[PDB]
Amino acid sequence: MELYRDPSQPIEVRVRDLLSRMTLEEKVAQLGSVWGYELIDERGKFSREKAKELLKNGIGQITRPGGSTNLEPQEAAELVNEIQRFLVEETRLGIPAMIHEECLTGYMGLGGTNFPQAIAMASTWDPDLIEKMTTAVREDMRKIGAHQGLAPVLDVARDPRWGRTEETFGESPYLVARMGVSYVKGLQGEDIKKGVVATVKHFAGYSASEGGKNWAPTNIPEREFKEVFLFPFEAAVKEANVLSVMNSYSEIDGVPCAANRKLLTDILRKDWGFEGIVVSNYFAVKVLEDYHRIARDKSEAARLALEAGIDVELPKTECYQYLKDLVEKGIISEALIDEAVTRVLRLKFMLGLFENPYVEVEKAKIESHRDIALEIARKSIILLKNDGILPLQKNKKVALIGPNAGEVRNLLGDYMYLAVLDAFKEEGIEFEYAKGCEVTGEDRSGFEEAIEIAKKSDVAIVVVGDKSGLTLDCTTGQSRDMANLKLPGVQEELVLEVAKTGKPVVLVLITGRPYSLKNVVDKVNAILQVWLPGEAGGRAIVDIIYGKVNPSGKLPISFPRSAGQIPVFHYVKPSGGRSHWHGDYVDESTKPLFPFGHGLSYTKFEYSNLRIEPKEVPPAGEVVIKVDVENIGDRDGDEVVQLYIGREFASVTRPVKELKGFKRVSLKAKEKKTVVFRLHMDVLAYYNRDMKLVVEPGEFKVMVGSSSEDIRLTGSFSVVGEKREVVGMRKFFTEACEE
Amino acid sequence: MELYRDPSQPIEVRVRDLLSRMTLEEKVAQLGSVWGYELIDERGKFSREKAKELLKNGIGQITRPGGSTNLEPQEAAELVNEIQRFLVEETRLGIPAMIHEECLTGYMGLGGTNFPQAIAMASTWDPDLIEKMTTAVREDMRKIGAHQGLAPVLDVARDPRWGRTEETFGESPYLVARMGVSYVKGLQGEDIKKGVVATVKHFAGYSASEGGKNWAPTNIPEREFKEVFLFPFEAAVKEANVLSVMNSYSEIDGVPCAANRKLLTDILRKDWGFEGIVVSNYFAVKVLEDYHRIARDKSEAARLALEAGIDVELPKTECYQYLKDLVEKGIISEALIDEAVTRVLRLKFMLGLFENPYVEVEKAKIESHRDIALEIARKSIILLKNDGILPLQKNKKVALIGPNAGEVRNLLGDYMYLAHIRALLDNIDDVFGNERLKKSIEEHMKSIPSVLDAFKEEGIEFEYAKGCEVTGEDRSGFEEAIEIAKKSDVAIVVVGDKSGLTLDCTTGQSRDMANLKLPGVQEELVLEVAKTGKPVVLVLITGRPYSLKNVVDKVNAILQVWLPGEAGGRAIVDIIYGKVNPSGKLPISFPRSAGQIPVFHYVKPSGGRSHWHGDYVDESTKPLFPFGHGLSYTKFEYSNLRIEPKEVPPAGEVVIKVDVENIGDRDGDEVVQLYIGREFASVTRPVKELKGFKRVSLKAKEKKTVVFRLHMDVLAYYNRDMKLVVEPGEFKVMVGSSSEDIRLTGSFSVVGEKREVVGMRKFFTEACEEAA
Amino acid sequence: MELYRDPSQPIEVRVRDLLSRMTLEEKVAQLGSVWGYELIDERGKFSREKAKELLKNGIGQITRPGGSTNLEPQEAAELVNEIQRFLVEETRLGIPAMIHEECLTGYMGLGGTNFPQAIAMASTWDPDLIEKMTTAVREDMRKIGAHQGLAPVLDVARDPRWGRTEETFGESPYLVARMGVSYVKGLQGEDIKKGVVATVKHFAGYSASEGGKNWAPTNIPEREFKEVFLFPFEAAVKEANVLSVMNSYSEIDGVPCAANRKLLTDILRKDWGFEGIVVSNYFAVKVLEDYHRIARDKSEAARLALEAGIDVELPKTECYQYLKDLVEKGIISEALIDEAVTRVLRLKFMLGLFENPYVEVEKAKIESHRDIALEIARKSIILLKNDGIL
Numbered sequence A: 001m002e003l004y005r006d007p008s009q010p011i012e013v014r015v016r017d018l019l020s021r022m023t024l025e026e027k028v029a030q031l032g033s034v035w036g037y038e039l040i041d042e043r044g045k046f047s048r049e050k051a052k053e054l055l056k057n058g059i060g061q062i063t064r065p066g067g068s069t070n071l072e073p074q075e076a077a078e079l080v081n082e083i084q085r086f087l088v089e090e091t092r093l094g095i096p097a098m099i100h101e102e103c104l105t106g107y108m109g110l111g112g113t114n115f116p117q118a119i120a121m122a123s124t125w126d127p128d129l130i131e132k133m134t135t136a137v138r139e140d141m142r143k144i145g146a147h148q149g150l151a152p153v154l155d156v157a158r159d160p161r162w163g164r165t166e167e168t169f170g171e172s173p174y175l176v177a178r179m180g181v182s183y184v185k186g187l188q189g190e191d192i193k194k195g196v197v198a199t200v201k202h203f204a205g206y207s208a209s210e211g212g213k214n215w216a217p218t219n220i221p222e223r224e225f226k227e228v229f230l231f232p233f234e235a236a237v238k239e240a241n242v243l244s245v246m247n248s249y250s251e252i253d254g255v256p257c258a259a260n261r262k263l264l265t266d267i268l269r270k271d272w273g274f275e276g277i278v279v280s281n282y283f284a285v286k287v288l289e290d291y292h293r294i295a296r297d298k299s300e301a302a303r304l305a306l307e308a309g310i311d312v313e314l315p316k317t318e319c320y321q322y323l324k325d326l327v328e329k330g331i332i333s334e335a336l337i338d339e340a341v342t343r344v345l346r347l348k349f350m351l352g353l354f355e356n357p358y359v360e361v362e363k364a365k366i367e368s369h370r371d372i373a374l375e376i377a378r379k380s381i382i383l384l385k386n387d388g389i390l391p392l393q394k395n396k397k398v399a400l401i402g403p404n405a406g407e408v409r410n411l412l413g414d415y416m417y418l419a420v421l422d423a424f425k426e427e428g429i430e431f432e433y434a435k436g437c438e439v440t441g442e443d444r445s446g447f448e449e450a451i452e453i454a455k456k457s458d459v460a461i462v463v464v465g466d467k468s469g470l471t472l473d474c475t476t477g478q479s480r481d482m483a484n485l486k487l488p489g490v491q492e493e494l495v496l497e498v499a500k501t502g503k504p505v506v507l508v509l510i511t512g513r514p515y516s517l518k519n520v521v522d523k524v525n526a527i528l529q530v531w532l533p534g535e536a537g538g539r540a541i542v543d544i545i546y547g548k549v550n551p552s553g554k555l556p557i558s559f560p561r562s563a564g565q566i567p568v569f570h571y572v573k574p575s576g577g578r579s580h581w582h583g584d585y586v587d588e589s590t591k592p593l594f595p596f597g598h599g600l601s602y603t604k605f606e607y608s609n610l611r612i613e614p615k616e617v618p619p620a621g622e623v624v625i626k627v628d629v630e631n632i633g634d635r636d637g638d639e640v641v642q643l644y645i646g647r648e649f650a651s652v653t654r655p656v657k658e659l660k661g662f663k664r665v666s667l668k669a670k671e672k673k674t675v676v677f678r679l680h681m682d683v684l685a686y687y688n689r690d691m692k693l694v695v696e697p698g699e700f701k702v703m704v705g706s707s708s709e710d711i712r713l714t715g716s717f718s719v720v721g722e723k724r725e726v727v728g729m730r731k732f733f734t735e736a737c738e739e
Numbered sequence B: 001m002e003l004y005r006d007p008s009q010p011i012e013v014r015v016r017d018l019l020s021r022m023t024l025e026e027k028v029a030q031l032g033s034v035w036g037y038e039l040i041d042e043r044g045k046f047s048r049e050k051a052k053e054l055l056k057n058g059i060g061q062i063t064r065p066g067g068s069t070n071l072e073p074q075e076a077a078e079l080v081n082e083i084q085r086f087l088v089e090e091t092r093l094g095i096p097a098m099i100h101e102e103c104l105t106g107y108m109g110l111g112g113t114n115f116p117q118a119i120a121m122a123s124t125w126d127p128d129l130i131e132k133m134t135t136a137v138r139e140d141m142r143k144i145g146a147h148q149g150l151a152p153v154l155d156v157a158r159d160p161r162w163g164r165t166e167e168t169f170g171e172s173p174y175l176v177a178r179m180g181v182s183y184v185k186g187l188q189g190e191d192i193k194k195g196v197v198a199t200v201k202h203f204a205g206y207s208a209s210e211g212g213k214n215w216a217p218t219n220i221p222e223r224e225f226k227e228v229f230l231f232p233f234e235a236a237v238k239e240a241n242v243l244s245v246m247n248s249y250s251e252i253d254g255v256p257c258a259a260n261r262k263l264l265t266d267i268l269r270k271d272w273g274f275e276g277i278v279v280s281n282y283f284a285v286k287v288l289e290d291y292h293r294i295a296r297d298k299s300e301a302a303r304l305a306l307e308a309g310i311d312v313e314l315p316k317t318e319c320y321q322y323l324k325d326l327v328e329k330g331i332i333s334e335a336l337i338d339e340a341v342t343r344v345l346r347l348k349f350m351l352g353l354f355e356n357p358y359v360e361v362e363k364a365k366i367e368s369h370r371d372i373a374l375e376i377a378r379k380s381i382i383l384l385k386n387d388g389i390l391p392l393q394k395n396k397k398v399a400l401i402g403p404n405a406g407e408v409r410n411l412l413g414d415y416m417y418l419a420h421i422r423a424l425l426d427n428i429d430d431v432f433g434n435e436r437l438k439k440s441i442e443e444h445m446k447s448i449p450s451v452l453d454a455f456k457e458e459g460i461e462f463e464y465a466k467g468c469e470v471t472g473e474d475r476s477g478f479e480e481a482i483e484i485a486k487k488s489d490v491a492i493v494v495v496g497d498k499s500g501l502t503l504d505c506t507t508g509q510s511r512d513m514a515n516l517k518l519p520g521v522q523e524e525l526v527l528e529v530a531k532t533g534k535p536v537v538l539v540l541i542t543g544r545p546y547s548l549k550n551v552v553d554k555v556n557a558i559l560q561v562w563l564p565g566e567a568g569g570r571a572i573v574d575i576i577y578g579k580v581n582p583s584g585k586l587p588i589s590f591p592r593s594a595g596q597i598p599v600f601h602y603v604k605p606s607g608g609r610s611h612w613h614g615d616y617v618d619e620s621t622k623p624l625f626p627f628g629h630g631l632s633y634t635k636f637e638y639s640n641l642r643i644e645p646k647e648v649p650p651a652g653e654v655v656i657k658v659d660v661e662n663i664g665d666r667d668g669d670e671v672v673q674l675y676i677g678r679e680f681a682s683v684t685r686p687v688k689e690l691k692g693f694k695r696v697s698l699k700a701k702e703k704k705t706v707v708f709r710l711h712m713d714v715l716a717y718y719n720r721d722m723k724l725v726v727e728p729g730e731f732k733v734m735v736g737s738s739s740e741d742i743r744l745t746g747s748f749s750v751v752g753e754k755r756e757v758v759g760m761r762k763f764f765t766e767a768c769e770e771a772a
Numbered sequence C: 001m002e003l004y005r006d007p008s009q010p011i012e013v014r015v016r017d018l019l020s021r022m023t024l025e026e027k028v029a030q031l032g033s034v035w036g037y038e039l040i041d042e043r044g045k046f047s048r049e050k051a052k053e054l055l056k057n058g059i060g061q062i063t064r065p066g067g068s069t070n071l072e073p074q075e076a077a078e079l080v081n082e083i084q085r086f087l088v089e090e091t092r093l094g095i096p097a098m099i100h101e102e103c104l105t106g107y108m109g110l111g112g113t114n115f116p117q118a119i120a121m122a123s124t125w126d127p128d129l130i131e132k133m134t135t136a137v138r139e140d141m142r143k144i145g146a147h148q149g150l151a152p153v154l155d156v157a158r159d160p161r162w163g164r165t166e167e168t169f170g171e172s173p174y175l176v177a178r179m180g181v182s183y184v185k186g187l188q189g190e191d192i193k194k195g196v197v198a199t200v201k202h203f204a205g206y207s208a209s210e211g212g213k214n215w216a217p218t219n220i221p222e223r224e225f226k227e228v229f230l231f232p233f234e235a236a237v238k239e240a241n242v243l244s245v246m247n248s249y250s251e252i253d254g255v256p257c258a259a260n261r262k263l264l265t266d267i268l269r270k271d272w273g274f275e276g277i278v279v280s281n282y283f284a285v286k287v288l289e290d291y292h293r294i295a296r297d298k299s300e301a302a303r304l305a306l307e308a309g310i311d312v313e314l315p316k317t318e319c320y321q322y323l324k325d326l327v328e329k330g331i332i333s334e335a336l337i338d339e340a341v342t343r344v345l346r347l348k349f350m351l352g353l354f355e356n357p358y359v360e361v362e363k364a365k366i367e368s369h370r371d372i373a374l375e376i377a378r379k380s381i382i383l384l385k386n387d388g389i390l
Ligand SMILES: O[C@@H]1[C@@H](O)[C@H](O[C@@H]2CO[C@@H](O[C@@H]3CO[C@@H](O[C@@H]4CO[C@@H](O)[C@H](O)[C@H]4O)[C@H](O)[C@H]3O)[C@H](O)[C@H]2O)OC[C@H]1O
Pocket: A581, B102, B150, B201, B281, B282, B283, B426, B430
């Protein structure tokens, strides 16, 4: 048999052999894609007639054979098998396709579990739980013959105007990077032939658009770019061996990311050693022409993207077919096509597709992971405020009010395929329900009814927030940016009208972004933040309200007092986070309403006995930080212990405090444990005036606490010795354990 | 005589001779400063006792001998002469001091005219008028023996939260640069021995702090930095030969500007050829330690600042005395001190101070420039909205309402002497441990014409109700205002800021406004007055854009009056009654709301919108009023666009002509604006960006031709490799009455090979008028 | 009077005023040159007929009015006075010429002392003696109305194959730099109105050609370049305030020095703060075309050299006349011409030429400096070996 067909040969040999056999047209075909829906008839069955046109010379990827066809799992699996058989048996070289789906919150297609949104995942501060989640997602995807998931989002969000905030892991490069590595590891596993390719997106800076506006310029200078925005992707590449990256739609400082070789090649491939495929953001090649206006035609767009280092044009071939013409006309070298094709073929071999591209349809029934979803929902909800009203007693009469109290659709996030009162009923609570108002618009005609049921109750539970998705009726999600951060519609007014009854008020926010709570916070008795929880949402909320679950989520993003305060974030430099010299704005504190890492409990945790050893370490040494934490209250609960590091008198300015470690710790009432952080000096490296990564001698401040503001214990150690340039591989994360 | 004393020798010879004679201590002394107030006794007279300690080895500068002493001009001149005589006659080498003052809106001291704020200056779009202004300021300053004015501000402002917005020339690097060059040219003149050193500030990026917060990081990437923030300073250095620069307090991306040699030396001196002195922002050296936490002590702060390229520590020696110790301990080379001292001595020779450091006290009486101030105020006020109510008829009974109708203090900006000095009053009042001044302030304040006075002089029948204060939540004055409105024909509601440095101020340095709502309950006052159903003219006397989304549709006309200083009242009333036809144009976009920030006219194709619904969920992405906006009591008709030639090579020139006719019934000035757009460059470019303008006077029914000469140098931008280029392709020409009100469009092409623009290149379009 | 004519005005004011009055043609003329021998008749006297063609719009420099004419000193002084009177009185703006001569081993013309070669100068290890020498050369040159001497050579020589070894101060960047500073200081003095502009050459690397062959590539890596070859020029610029630099004919690693903005502008002007004029090596602009083959015609050669930072084309205008055409055709900006013209006019003001461009012919008799020459010769000879015979 030909070498490329022989599984006893090393992949490099098979790749070289195959490439040597391919025509230019066949090469270019491997750099494009076709939609699943383009390959089916009106009953969702594979159409050989359509495949003969679209797959004649092979194809790089099939886009969303499940997500774009609305097929149930077994039918999607059958479609994918039929596509693969056509490629294997009815093309000249028989190269199989790679299949991709969205999977951020689970496989985005019929029959898959709708897990809580990414910002909820982050709020758990539980990396192992997220790895468990994506290990499940991996098996769901493989059942239908899907090889690649377009997740996770490693965009670092400090601008909650942006509609895609919900898809991020929040403001902290450390927490984003750590959750990202766990996410990737679960999807891919050790041998990708048994796993699913992860796709970190949107490389890079995409969460920092001008004015929080989708696709607008992300004008970030170099040190900030490296330390905040690139860092999570760097960790995914080097620690998690991520096998795909997708680019940002935005320009950075005049250069669209899809046309930026310095970004997609020089940083990603040359500096960091990425060996997988870069897939375009959907239509990102064409919009080099249409939107950014730097390419005069589809040929030029193709050339810019290929030179930049985009290997596969998604979601359908549009500009990359003109790569054939560009070679034939002597405008680009076929060697550059070969480089891209090599990357794509290698990954196809690594996935095992040339040995077996088929799945067993009888096994393609996707299993529910409602259990994992509920664990995330229960650990993600954040208790922002509680004057003692919560937990409630079951014998209290509840007035359940608001648009998000009754509305299952509004529990869903923007990449859940299908984009509470029931939970109260199941728990056996006596309540009356009033919608109060819609999520959007100005209609106040439901206020009187809500007020009247409040007046007759013991406690009003007001459930407000977003509708997430991509259409105009949505208040958050991709393309739905909110300038002024007010709760949508007249929901704020509803809360305040209910509060005016004098009844106790529990405010439940079911939202995708931070909202300004400045006008309600001091008028309500407790506040729960419930990031869009998907199919597990209702149960977790009621579990928390009644104390069956002790809330344990912590904010992964700061809650601004107002939009005019943006940005607020915990790791400001000494000059950040204040106005000099009066501290505050004329009209507003410079402090966020709720800080990063904030989250209360129905119990109290007491921290003691900080140990830092040794007190002096050299610039590639390690310190071990220990604290004791005791649950001194009356309820079992989890605490997320947080490690912040500060530095002064470096050669550049540094954060006053910045997250460098954390551990979720379970404590029974009156239980005490020791939490241990092992901190390698590599983890503290920062860029100096010359853009070198260094550790400089001096003092580092250690701050351990329950939030970025609720610091319990402080101390310090010193780095002693000559400045160190940190070269080559280095540690990214602290290790945490319990003793 | 020693060579340095001999005026027949070239300055370089005199400098080298002097430097060769100086001790290390004497050298370090030239890099520092003393406050004016440290050199006077209780009667405001020079104190030899204090001078013996502070000036014994000479000094670089005296900080604000007028501005910090509350001396009248002849007394300040006497002080300065006595300081110079002490230096000339009672120090070993007899080196005279340079004196600096604030002068942004005029010499900031007693007796100086209070001109309108810088943002008002920009709103005139009249560079020559600003040059006339600073030529007058030059003469005022020289009368008191001042050599350097700490102006202008070339910070480009796109974030109106920032309290220093009023000190800027707005959002456009083009307009800021062009106004800055005129400003500098007027202060300095041709021969600096007869002029005043200008000080461009705050180098660079200082108007782009995180969240609009004073001193917070200004994290700007390189092409934006060069094209937006550096550009006005580049023009000031290369076209206007500016002789001083002051640094930004902020860090850029981890590096404090006061410690950044890449900025204060490599860009400013090496790349651009700046030959003057860099003066520290006040206390900027020390706060490398105290604020940024990158210097461990005062010695290290001094070293970082000197290495970066700061020549003089202001406002008083604090860290730079330790440069002596650093040399003596072999930590720094004396050669690096010599480089700084050389710059300072050269400028002192160039100012003529070694030939004559004295002024004639009998001539030190500063003249009023109310005339120039009034021309600026009259050309600066912007008509943002007018449904036809303006101009008003003089027979209409007016209800004059609001805090800014009745308080002269609130006409003043943050670097006008009687506003700025309030901070000192606070600090004196805060002394709880171990007079004539508060009286001289009040009496000088009383001299300033009021808005009330202006209405009275114009002969209008009106009643006045304060309505509310600038700050706080007290609505107990609303009822009175509402009642006088109900009894009137028209309510003129005058609201806005109190500008300054203290907590009771709403704008100015250190007073940043997050949410851009009119201060206090002033918005509510406007809306309550409107609810009477009477016609409402809203007059904003402010230092920044405010959100007007909640009032714009509820009022009949809106006038923006950037803090106008002493000419304010007359100009406002002149405009309201049509004695002056408003002609100001916005130099900065007015956001709909704070959450929309930033909004600016020169967005890239992906800027200024949210894709793919265009708007935010809750808000338009368009500003409420765009850059260049400003209405008139007449109408201007644009015709006959000519663009020649249609194809030009990469260092060629195109000539753009338009005819503009005043087709209305009142004489008026129009500011004709030229915008250029470009696509299919190798980098993204603004869809439209200002590249030229001309204020043109037109009588009723008069037509003139406006001509723009546009060299391709002016269009240069930075490519992917950070080279300044002109690339072949098509440029769109858009000429109109604002950045949105484009009247005529066309295009020309650049033909030939891509050009790297090297060395000196043109910065500005030339604009003139011809007979139509 | 016009500001540029007024000696009470600062030079910067005079420069800006003059530049503002000049046509493009007059500007370009200040960036070129004419040979002395092109301006004389068969009897060695100034020719008004020849001047009317060659000087009609003014000129940057006259090349070697003594060195190229075989005139005795008083006759060369007369020639130079007649050239200057023509420029001052019979051109529109009356800008005087700068005159240059060779002077490495003394004024290179009849009547000047022949001092020992530069390598002999270095062999004295006596910087003050060399400063005494060039102080004398200064007075010789000023007597004939010469303003600039094309010396010293600061090329550091480690390859004795090269025929220009004798013109260098040898192999040591330290000794070359120290001798160079003294050389420059003697020629220029404190106030250049009373001195002669020195011209450090050949910037830079020119003594390190492939195989020791004249004009061949000088392929020197960056640290060596900075520490060995640039260092003496750096010292001349920063310590000695040298007012002219002349470029190397060679390429460095693919880039001819006459076309290298990174060298003649970014290092020399931006990094080091040089404020004088860069004068081309003779014919160096044209040979960007003829020899290096990187310019397709004289226009392109002119553009490359001007962009690189050459202010004056020597020894005669050849390519730089096309700078007029390049501006008129919109290929280069007139601002770039203005930058060069500014440098040239500033130096002409600093030399006092607008106050007095003439010399007294009765004083133009150059004195012998055999005494100084003998001290150098006596201190320069090296005893390499002596078994006792001497
Ligand atoms: O109320 C009291 C507070 O004021 C005081 O805090 C200090 C207030 O003054 C602050 O220093 C300021 C810093 O900014 C300087 O402005 C520059 C001056 O020169 C201008 O040309 C330039 O444009 C400006 O940027 C200003 O001169 C100086 O006074 C100081 O940092 C504060 O700490 O604390 C005590 C309270 O009672």
